[PDB]
């Protein structure tokens, strides 16, 4: 996250931290995600496509720090890793960048809400907030485009939804933005998601509910003028989601 503020998991209790275990026994951070029901975390397919084996992944909930333990955190294995069959990576952009992780503890329990863990609501099918609505993004992504290290404490910031019309201007993204994506950015281009925030939530109030509107997908630099963050449009994927969350 570029700019914004350090936060804790209590202020973003649906946030899931996903890590991968390597052959050496080393474990490194992969992507963010969001807890949409006790047994299900939603993220991006680009995170997993290079190594799509469920066994190699660990999901933490209730975690406020990247490489140290938070009190109240809970560790889960991945019972199913579900990538979208129509995922593709374009020269600039990703398409259908959405993934589901069914989580289970070694004990066999799904998530249990607490001070530090809660689900986030899904939007109604094809229902989004209007352009200019303020939304929240959260993650352990870089604080600067040029950084080599990731922040150890969770960060969040506010961005505003951008119209499809505006996002499609060629000085923005031109043809590469589709209606299955949402753009969002700071009106002065001062704060943004960045490398390592991918898979994480874009959360907007829609009606009276904190709602998962976007999943962090792609963008050129971070906080760079005329280049918004691009997000998977969650409202366009409910059938896909419900087909899997029924088991």
């Amino acid at each position: 996250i570029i700019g914004g503020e350090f936060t804790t998991i209590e202020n973003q209790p649906w946030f899931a931290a996903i890590y991968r275990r390597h052959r050496g026994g080393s474990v490194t951070y992969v992507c963010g995600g969001s807890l949409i029901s006790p047994c299900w975390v939603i993220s991006a397919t680009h995170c997993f496509i290079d190594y799509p084996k469920k066994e190699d992944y660990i999901v933490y909930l209730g975690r406020s720090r990247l490489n140290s333990n938070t009190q109240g955190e809970m560790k889960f294995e991945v019972e199913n890793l579900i990538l979208h069959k129509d995922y593709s990576a374009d020269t600039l952009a990703y398409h259908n960048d959405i993934a589901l992780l069914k989580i289970r503890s070694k004990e066999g329990r799904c998530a249990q809400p607490s001070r530090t863990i809660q689900t986030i609501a899904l939007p109604s099918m094809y229902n989004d907030p209007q352009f200019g609505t303020s939304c929240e993004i959260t993650g352990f992504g870089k604080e600067q485009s040029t950084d080599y290290l990731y922040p150890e404490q969770l960060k969040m910031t506010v961005v505003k939804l951008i119209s499809h019309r505006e996002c499609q201007q060629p000085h923005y993204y031109g043809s590469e933005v589709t209606t299955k994506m949402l753009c969002a950015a700071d009106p002065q281009w001062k704060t943004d998601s960045c490398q390592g925030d991918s898979g994480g939530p874009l959360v907007c109030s829609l009606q009276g509910r904190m709602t998962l509107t976007g999943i962090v997908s792609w963008g050129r630099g971070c906080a760079l003028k005329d280049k918004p963050g691009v997000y998977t449009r969650v409202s366009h994927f409910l059938p896909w989601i419900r087909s899997h969350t029924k088991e």
């Binding site: 992507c31 992504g141 490398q195 963008g219």
Partner: peptide, 10 residues
């Protein structure tokens, strides 16, 4: 890796 990836691994 797309040129505008945000993945740690890109």
């Amino acid at each position: 890796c797309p040129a505008y990836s945000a993945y740690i691994g890109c």
